[PDB]
Amino acid sequence: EGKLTVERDMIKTETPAFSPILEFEQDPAQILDALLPLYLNSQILRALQESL
């Protein structure tokens, strides 16, 4: 009602993998090691957004 409110909503993203036709052009292991910086960055930006 008349007070504007805050819902910490949860919609799940697409949980398909990459394709069976898709190939790991460089490495499985190094791409894991790379995405770790990406995922750490994603959670960190989201955390700073959460605090702000």
DSSP run (H or E) holding 32: helix 29-51
Phi-psi region of 38 (alpha: psi -120 to 50; beta: other; left: phi over 0): alpha
What is the smallest separation between the CB atom of 12 and other proteins, expressed in angstroms? 29
Interface with other proteins (CB under 8 A), residue total: 3
Determine if 23 is a binding residue for other proteins (CB under 8 A).
yes
The reply to whether 20 sits near other proteins by the rule CB under 8 A is yes
According to the binding rule CB under 8 A, does residue 17 interact with other proteins? no
Binding site for other proteins (CB under 8 A): 20-21, 23
